[PDB]
């Protein structure tokens, strides 16, 4: 938690799984520890950021990322509160935004490389195979 | 022993005493591998470890 | 508004006043779990009111799952009566509600982020952890589960009046961050 | 000579950071007053050097009850050559 | 003297002490060894702060005050012994590269492209 | 009286139903002994 705060403050954002897959912490006492850490600095007084690094390993070009942004942008505002762990929808954004493309990004590749079982990818894309219609800016 | 059974009744009483389950199902049907419907079964089970 | 929270769980404690034999008590009661090496208490239940009794050898015993104070008390008395059936001088005493769980829905979607930012010291919210916003109130000291859906869960109350005051105080803020 | 890595670098370099996969390989993965007294007398009868912690581990009883049993049913020795021996 | 280095000396330095072993005594004893592999060296790049990584051209290095290095990679044999018997690829650093060396993008590039690479031929 | 003697290994239940899997026991039903290797006693709880 002492770094995720710094990251979450360094304008960079990481999932908990991520530093958890840097350090094993069982995430729960951590999750409280991070929660209570936040409320510490609360008294001691944003899901897009991942997408570049996501595709950064995917060797992608920025358009799918940018498109994924407006897709991620559109999904949240209207309805489809979208994700509850919405790094999910950050990912389905990637995949459907590469479903916008012909370029080889099998969700099989995506899941094993973004670490989400493709079921929500289908489902995310599913409501987005329904919400692609209002997801045509270009 | 090679027979396979499956009881599905309603538990009226049951008790645990020193790694000993008890259960008491009334009007319980048991599937074999056939089905024999028995009202009265007294189930008491202990640890096998 | 005009919305009353729906109590979902009342946790209460009752003193039986006698040393029990958890083996005998589990063995004779119609409905009572007790695994010693997993938990040193009889986990007993009834059907009406559908509750769960957490019966310690001390006679200390815990009821939850009731959705009213009266049903919790009645369940406690039924449990004490069934203990008396076995032959222990059980007495339903020191009934005391320790928790009251409530929930409701304001039906309108909420802006949790502007909420948490606007109410940080009472707002803990990590959507990647928990889809809901934790709101901790001072008076009444009730902590709220705030969901974008408009679903709320109220908890930490010794009294349902604390639940109702809790929702009444939270509702203006709910309406505020209603996403429209 | 050296095999340079022909992959582009994200795929080569995503791995040695946060490959999301961990532990692929296994490598250095690392009581009744009456009952306690009867057992304490037994172990003391069984062994004059009936060690207290060894009694606690073997009797599998709460430590406080076992020592109380050994305090009067066994010779409470904490000094001398037979240290931690309850005869 | 750099092409010589990157090719051979780097490796021979690894191969000298790939191995180092730790033996735990039991009550049958353990014995842990770890050994390295042949060394792998990339084509130069940068870890940007966000996290993204990408190829880097000598030109951009100069004006981003960057460092014209390429990473290093070696094979690791993590293993165990218990003691007489035994029960991927690893980053080890960034190495600056002499320009115009095989490991530099330019050691081939065409003169025209040098203009497109904005590097005086 | 239809008292079957078996050893429990695993039990599964969440406040409405009992699942006492039974191994190496006998079922005496209608004066007929039932010898089984595995059992899943799916008792229901009101």
The verdict on C118 and C50 lying in the same domain is no
Resolution in A: 3.4
Decide if D14 contacts E91 (C-beta within 8 A). Answer: no
A contact set with D (CB within 8 A): 17-18, 21-22, 24, 56-59, 113, 115
The verdict on C108 and C85 lying in the same domain is no
The verdict on C16 and C92 lying in the same domain is yes
Q: Which of C53, C68, C97 is the last residue of a domain?
A: C97
**Least Cα separation, residue E116 to chain D (angstroms):** 21
The verdict on C155 and C129 lying in the same domain is yes
How far apart (Å, rounded) are the C-alpha atoms in residues E15 and C74? 79
The structure's method of determination equals cryo-EM
Counting one residue from chain B and one from chain C, the pairs whose CB atoms sit within 8 A come to 31
Query: How many distinct structural domains can be found in chain C?
Result: 2
Q: Beta-strand (E) ranges in D1-87?
A: none
Compute how many other C-beta atoms are within 10 angstroms of the C-beta atom of residue C45. Answer: 21
How far apart (Å, rounded) are the C-alpha atoms in residues C116 and C110? 11
Give the burial class of A86: count Cβ atoms within 10 A of its Cβ; 0-12 exposed, 13-18 middle, 19 or more buried.
Answer: buried
Backbone phi, psi, residue B47, to 5°: -75, 140
F45 chain-C contacts, CB cut-off 8 A: 31
Task: Look up residue D44 and give its two tokens.
Answer: 């003391």
Decide if C50 contacts C70 (C-beta within 8 A). Answer: no
D13 chain-A contacts, CB cut-off 8 A: 57
End-to-end CA distance of chain E: 22
SS (H, E, C) chain A: CCCHHHHHHCCCCCCHHHHHCCCCCCCHHHHHHHHHHHHHHHHHCCCCCHHHHHHHHCCCCHHHHHHHHHHHHHHHHHCCCCCCCCHHHHHHHHHHHHHCCCCCCCHHHHHHHHCCCHHHHHHHHHHHHHHCCCCCCC
A84 chain-C contacts, CB cut-off 8 A: 127, 131
Tell how strand F3-12 and strand B35-47 pair up.
parallel
Q: Which residues is chain A interrupted after (C–N above 2.5 Å)? A: 45
| Chain C contact for F46 (CB, 8 A cutoff) | yes
Tell how strand C123-124 and strand F32-41 pair up.
unpaired
Domain that holds residue C29: 12-97
Tell how strand E20-22 and strand E32-41 pair up.
antiparallel
CA-CA distances (angstroms) from residue C117 to A38, A84, C133? 12, 19, 11
| Chain B contact for F33 (CB, 8 A cutoff) | no
The verdict on C120 and C87 lying in the same domain is no
Instruction: Give chains near D: 3+ CB pairs under 8 A.
Output: A, E
Decide if F39 contacts F7 (C-beta within 8 A). Answer: no
Counting one residue from chain D and one from chain E, the pairs whose CB atoms sit within 8 A come to 52
Task: Look up residue E33 and give its two tokens.
Answer: 């060894």
Residue in C109, C55, C49, C47 with CA at minimum distance from that of residue C73: C49
Task: Look up residue A78 and give its two tokens.
Answer: 């209207």
The verdict on C76 and C114 lying in the same domain is no
Beta partners for residue E70, in sequence order: E95
How far apart (Å, rounded) are the C-alpha atoms in residues E86 and E88? 18
Q: Which residue of B has its CA nearest to C34?
A: B16
The verdict on C115 and C53 lying in the same domain is no
CA-CA distances (angstroms) from residue C179 to A8, A69, C129? 25, 21, 22
Decide if C104 contacts C167 (C-beta within 8 A). Answer: yes
Could you tell me the domains of chain B? 3-48 (2.30.18.10)
- Largest distance between two CA atoms of chain D: 79
B12 chain-C contacts, CB cut-off 8 A: 30
How far apart (Å, rounded) are the C-alpha atoms in residues B25 and F3? 11
**3-state class (DSSP) for residue A18:** helix
Phi-psi domain of C17 (left: phi exceeds 0; alpha: psi -120 through 50; beta: other): left
Residues 6+ apart with CB under 8 A from D45: none
Q: What angle do CA C25, C28, C31 make, to 5 degrees?
A: 85
Beta partners for residue E89, in sequence order: E75
Compute how many other C-beta atoms are within 10 angstroms of the C-beta atom of residue C7. Answer: 21
Instruction: Give chains near E: 3+ CB pairs under 8 A.
Output: A, D
**3-state class (DSSP) for residue B22:** strand
The verdict on C167 and C178 lying in the same domain is yes
Decide if C110 contacts C148 (C-beta within 8 A). Answer: yes
Helix (H) or strand (E) holding B12: strand B3-16
The verdict on C109 and C125 lying in the same domain is yes
D contact set with A (CB within 8 A): 8, 10-11, 13-14, 18-22
Inter-chain touch A22–D14, beta carbons under 8 Å: no
Task: Look up residue E11 and give its two tokens.
Answer: 């490796």
Residue in C161, C79, C170, C102 with CA at minimum distance from that of residue C133: C170
Task: Look up residue E61 and give its two tokens.
Answer: 């290095």
Beta partners for residue C110, in sequence order: C178
- CATH architecture assignment, domain A49-130: Orthogonal Bundle (1.10)
**3-state class (DSSP) for residue E117:** coil
Give the CB-side neighbour count of residue E85, counting CA atoms within 13 A. 2
Cα dihedral sign, A22-A23-A25-A30: negative
Inter-chain touch E10–D2, beta carbons under 8 Å: yes
Residue in E31, E11, E7, E30 with CA at minimum distance from that of residue E21: E31
The verdict on C93 and C57 lying in the same domain is yes
């Amino acid at each position: 938690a002492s770094i995720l705060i710094g990251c979450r403050r360094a304008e960079v954002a990481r999932t908990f799984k991520e530093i958890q897959s840097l350090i094993h912490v069982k995430t729960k006492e951590f999750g409280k520890t991070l929660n209570i850490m936040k409320n510490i600095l609360r008294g001691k007084s944003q899901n897009l950021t991942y997408i570049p690094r996501f595709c950064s390993h995917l060797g992608l070009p920025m358009q799918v990322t940018t498109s994924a942004e407006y897709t991620a942008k559109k999904c949240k505002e209207i309805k489809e509160i979208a994700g509850k762990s919405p790094i999910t929808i950050a990912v389905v954004s990637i995949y459907l935004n590469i479903l916008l493309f012909q370029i080889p990004i099998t969700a099989a590749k995506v899941g094993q490389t973004l670490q989400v079982t493709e079921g929500t990818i289908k489902s995310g894309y599913k409501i987005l195979y329904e919400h692609r219609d209002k997801l045509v800016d270009p | 022993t090679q027979s396979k059974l499956t009881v599905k009744g309603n538990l009226d009483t049951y008790g645990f005493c020193d790694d000993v389950w008890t259960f008491i199902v009334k009007n319980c049907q048991v599937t074999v591998e056939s089905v024999i419907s028995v009202d009265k079964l007294r189930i008491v089970a202990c640890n096998s470890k | 508004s005009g919305i009353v929270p729906t109590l979902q769980n009342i946790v209460a404690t009752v003193t039986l006043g006698c040393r029990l034999d958890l083996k005998t008590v589990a063995l004779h009661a119609r409905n009572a779990e007790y695994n010693p090496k997993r938990f040193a208490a009889v986990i007993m239940r009834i059907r009406e009111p559908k509750t769960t009794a957490l019966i310690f050898a001390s006679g200390k015993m815990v009821v939850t799952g009731a959705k009213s104070e009266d049903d919790s008390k009645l369940a406690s008395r039924k449990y004490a009566r069934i203990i008396q059936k076995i032959g222990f001088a059980a007495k339903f005493t020191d009934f005391k509600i320790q928790n009251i769980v409530g929930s409701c829905d304001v039906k309108f979607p909420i802006r949790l982020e502007g909420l948490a930012f606007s109410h940080g010291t009472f707002s803990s919210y990590e959507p990647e952890l928990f889809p809901g916003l934790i709101y901790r109130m001072v008076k009444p000291k009730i902590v709220l589960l705030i969901f974008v859906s408009g679903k709320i869960v109220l908890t930490g109350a010794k009294q349902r009046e604390e639940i109702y005051q809790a929702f009444e105080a939270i509702y203006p803020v709910l309406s505020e961050f209603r996403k429209m | 000579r050296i095999t340079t890595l022909d992959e582009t670098v994200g795929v080569t370099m995503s791995h040695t950071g946060m490959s999301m996969r961990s532990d692929n390989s296994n490598f250095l993965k690392v009581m009744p007053k009456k009952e306690i007294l009867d057992y304490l007398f037994k172990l003391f009868d069984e062994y004059d050097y009936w060690s207290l912690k060894g009694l606690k581990e073997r009797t599998r009883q709460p430590e406080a009850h076992l020592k109380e049993c050994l305090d009067k049913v066994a010779t409470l020795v904490k000094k001398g050559p037979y240290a931690f021996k309850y005869t | 003297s750099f092409n010589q280095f990157v090719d051979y000396t780097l490796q021979d330095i690894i191969c000298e002490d790939s191995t180092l072993i730790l033996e735990q005594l039991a009550q049958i004893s353990r014995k842990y060894e770890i050994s390295f592999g042949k060394i792998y060296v990339t084509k130069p790049m940068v870890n940007e702060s966000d996290g993204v990584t990408h190829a880097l051209y000598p030109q951009e290095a100069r004006l981003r005050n960057l460092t014209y290095s390429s990473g290093l990679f070696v094979d690791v044999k993590k293993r165990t012994y218990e003691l007489k018997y035994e029960l991927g690829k690893v980053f080890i650093g960034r190495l600056p590269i002499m320009l115009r060396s095989k490991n530099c993008y330019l050691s081939e590039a065409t003169e025209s492209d040098l203009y497109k690479l904005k590097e005086c031929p | 009286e239809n008292l079957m003697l078996c050893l429990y290994d695993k039990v599964t239940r969440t406040k409405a139903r009992w699942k006492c899997s039974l191994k190496d026991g006998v079922v005496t039903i209608n004066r007929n002994d039932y010898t089984f290797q595995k059992a899943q006693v799916e008792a229901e709880w009101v």
